[PDB]
Write a protein that binds this ligand. Structure first.
Ligand SMILES: [Mn+2]
Ligand SMILES: [Mn+2]
Ligand SMILES: [Mn+2]
Length: 192
DNA sequence: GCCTTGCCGGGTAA
DNA sequence: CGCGCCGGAACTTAC
DNA sequence: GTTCCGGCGCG
DNA sequence: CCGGCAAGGC
C-alpha cells in the first residue's frame, strides 16, 4: 500500500477538482461529513471511480457505504463518513509533502477532473492559483515545462498550460504511469 | 507558412 | 439529548 | 460543485 | 472545459 497512498492521491485529485469535502451542520444538533466526486457519466463513476473508492474504504475499515445520487446535470459519488472526511482533509493539508508517486496520482486525478480532455492542448483550469503553483513545481521537477496565467477574467479562473513541446513526456510519464490507476483515455490509448 | 500559447465568449458539467 | 450515517435534490457556478 | 431537506441509528 | 482567433516566434 504504496498502492492505497496512490489510489488516495488519485481520488484526492478528483475530489479537489470535481467534488468536495463537506462538513455539515443540521437541526439539531445533527451533523454529517461527506466525501464527494461529481461527474456527468454514470458509468465512469460506477466503473472507474467507485471501485477505487471502495478499495480505499475497505483498507481503512470505513463502515460507510458508497452512495451514487442522480442529479439533473451530474451524478454524485458520495461517502458519508467523518473518518474518511478527515482522512482526505489532512492529506490535503500535507499536499506539499507528497512523494513522487503521489504527485503523479494526484496530477492524473486533477487532470481527469479539470484537464483539457481532447489532449490536443494540455491544460488544467482552476480558481486556486496556489494549488496550480504546487502542480507547476511538481511538473518542472518532472521535466515538464508549463506556464500559468489568468484565462478567465469574469470568474478568476486560472489555467496551467503544459508546453506541447513536452507532450510525449507528460502523456507517457505522468498520465500513463502504471504505478497507480490509469485514467480513461490513457488506459484506452495503451490498449489502442 | 506551421506551431505554439495567450486571450476570450458560450454554456455544460460540474 | 447529542452527534453521525442515509437518500434525495434544489440551488449556485467553475470550469 | 454546495448546502439544504426528512429520515434513522446509537450511546 | 471547449474551441476559435490572432500575436508572436522560428
Ligand atoms: Mn474544480
Ligand atoms: Mn470541474
Ligand atoms: Mn470534470
Amino acid at each position: 500500500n504504496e498502492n492505497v497512498s496512490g489510489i488516495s492521491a488519485y481520488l484526492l485529485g478528483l475530489i479537489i477538482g470535481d467534488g468536495g469535502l463537506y462538513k455539515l451542520k443540521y437541526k439539531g444538533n445533527r451533523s454529517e461529513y461527506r466525501v464527494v466526486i461529481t461527474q456527468k457519466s454514470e458509468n465512469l463513476i460506477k466503473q472507474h471511480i467507485a471501485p477505487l473508492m471502495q478499495f480505499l474504504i475497505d483498507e481503512l475499515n470505513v463502515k460507510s457505504k458508497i452512495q451514487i445520487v442522480k442529479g439533473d446535470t451530474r451524478y454524485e459519488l458520495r461517502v458519508s463518513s467523518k473518518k474518511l472526511y478527515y482522512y482526505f482533509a489532512n492529506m490535503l493539508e500535507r499536499i506539499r509533502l507528497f512523494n513522487m508517486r503521489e504527485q503523479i496520482a494526484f496530477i492524473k486525478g486533477l487532470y481527469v477532473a479539470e484537464g483539457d480532455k481532447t489532449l490536443k492542448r494540455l491544460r488544467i483550469w482552476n480558481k486556486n492559483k496556489a494549488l496550480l503553483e504546487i502542480v507547476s513545481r511538481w511538473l518542472n521537477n518532472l521535466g515538464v515545462r508549463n506556464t500559468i496565467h489568468l484565462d478567465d477574467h469574469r470568474h478568476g479562473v486560472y489555467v496551467l498550460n503544459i508546453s506541447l513541446r513536452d507532450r510525449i513526456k507528460f502523456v507517457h510519464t505522468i498520465l500513463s504511469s502504471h504505478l497507480n490507476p490509469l485514467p480513461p483515455e490513457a488506459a484506452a490509448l495503451e490498449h489502442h
